[PDB]
Amino acid sequence: HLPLIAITRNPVFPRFIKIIEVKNKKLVELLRRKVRLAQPYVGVFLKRD
C-alpha cells in the first residue's frame, strides 16, 4: 500500500538482481519510513517510452 516508485531509466528483469540509483533524495524518505514496520517491502514496475 505505497505510491508508485520513480523507475527513472532502470530495467529490472524478472529474477535478475539489479541496482537503482536515483539522484534525487526524496525516495530515500520512503525507504526510511518503512523501517519500523514488521515486514519492509517494495514493488517494481515498468515505464512507457
Binding site: 531509466r9 532502470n10 541496482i19 540509483e21
Partner: protein, 48 residues
Amino acid sequence: MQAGQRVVDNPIYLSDMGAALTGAESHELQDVLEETNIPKRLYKALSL
C-alpha cells in the same frame, strides 16, 4: 564503473576514458578531440 551497473550516466566520458588508455602520441589525442561525429571517434579510439 562496470558496463553492467548502468552507472555510465555520461557515455562521452566513458568513451574518452577508454581512449585515454591508448599510448598514442599527443597529436593523435588532439586529432581525436577534433573529431565531432560519434562513430569516427569510437572507431579511431578502437584503432588506437
